[PDB]
Design a protein around this nucleic acid. Sequence first.
DNA 1: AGGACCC
DNA 2: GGGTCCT
Length: 373
Amino acid sequence: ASSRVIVHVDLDCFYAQVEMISNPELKDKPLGVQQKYLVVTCNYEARKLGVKKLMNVRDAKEKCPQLVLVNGEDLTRYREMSYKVTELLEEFSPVVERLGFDENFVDLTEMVEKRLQQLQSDELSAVTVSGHVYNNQSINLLDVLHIRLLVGSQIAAEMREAMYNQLGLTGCAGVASNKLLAKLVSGVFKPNQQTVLLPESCQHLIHSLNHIKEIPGIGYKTAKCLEALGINSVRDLQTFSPKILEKELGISVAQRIQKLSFGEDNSPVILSGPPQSFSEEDSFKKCSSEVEAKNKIEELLASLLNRVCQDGRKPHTVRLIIRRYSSEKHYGRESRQCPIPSHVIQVMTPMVDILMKLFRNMTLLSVCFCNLK
DNA sequence: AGGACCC
DNA sequence: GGGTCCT
Ligand SMILES: Cc1cn([C@H]2C[C@H](O)[C@@H](COP(=O)(O)OP(=O)(O)OP(=O)(O)O)O2)c(=O)[nH]c1=O
Ligand SMILES: [Mg+2]
Ligand SMILES: [Mg+2]
């Protein structure tokens, strides 16, 4: 269990795709999915006209006045389609890890190997790639790692075809030897295309990034830290002192991100299975007076109860989350958590009242059920 | 409870 | 507007 073949599947303009399927009249029209003041995503017709992902509505309608907007605040249908995609992938190989609602990783290593043991010592020379080869790299048919990655590209093309034929969804895929690289390479040709990464082009792909924030795993805060240190390019990170990095970011953060800067990433694809929590949210800027609003909490609850039910298992914890107004105090939500009584597991009024007291203990209200069993 | 990451 | 795992 050394060399892996991993695929990262990444759907095209996911919420917009779901809305275009629901209302066929939105096809070939420029479309944005709105949540509050944000155009959270848009179809590719809208991107040709200047609309970017996560652009506020104002900027977006003055870049593109004719933009059709649909409301995407209720995630129900996106969430449903997202699990349909994961399940279809699980049918290929069971170990599928979700990332957000529209990305999945699958470890294809076992599948690839079983396909190779099936071919004769003749048709191995007929193995061909499906889709793009990153950096137009030459294939060496006597290189076993090349052969396995190409069989990985064929599986990926089968997955994308099944998604289209069974669920009507288009998506990109990237095939590589670990999750970092599969995820980086999946986005090289978009929309609705796939690319495979041969090992010799791994430095080319990593150095194609323009800042270390682009590395999945290095977030807003770590990037701000690395900068403070004079680290800006992937190369700066690759060459920087391991010791200074260690005694500055913790040993954990430091040795992992430095590895990532080389293209190295041993993390396993983890079976996501059923979700670990179920929540719903409501935003309203200045609107929570601090008493009048629990009617909101009752609404969040009623939706949640139907979902948490549906699932089969039951939650043993409830949590209440709030955010508060004033100045740009850039992070700071607050939560109170307590167990759910065992009487009340086996519905509304007692839940509403647990919530209200938790409220009393303490722009945004949400409820989250977790600790499912 | 809260932090940091992800989409 | 969701979601994960770690401290
Ligand atoms: C980053 C992000 C994504 N999303 C949602 C909208 C997207 O349709 C879905 C997947 O995110 P992404 O894959 O980044 O975006 P996308 O699928 O819409 O577009 P692309 O073709 O470039 O892949 O997640 C949010 O709601 N909020 C966020 O902050
Ligand atoms: Mg994505
Ligand atoms: Mg996507």
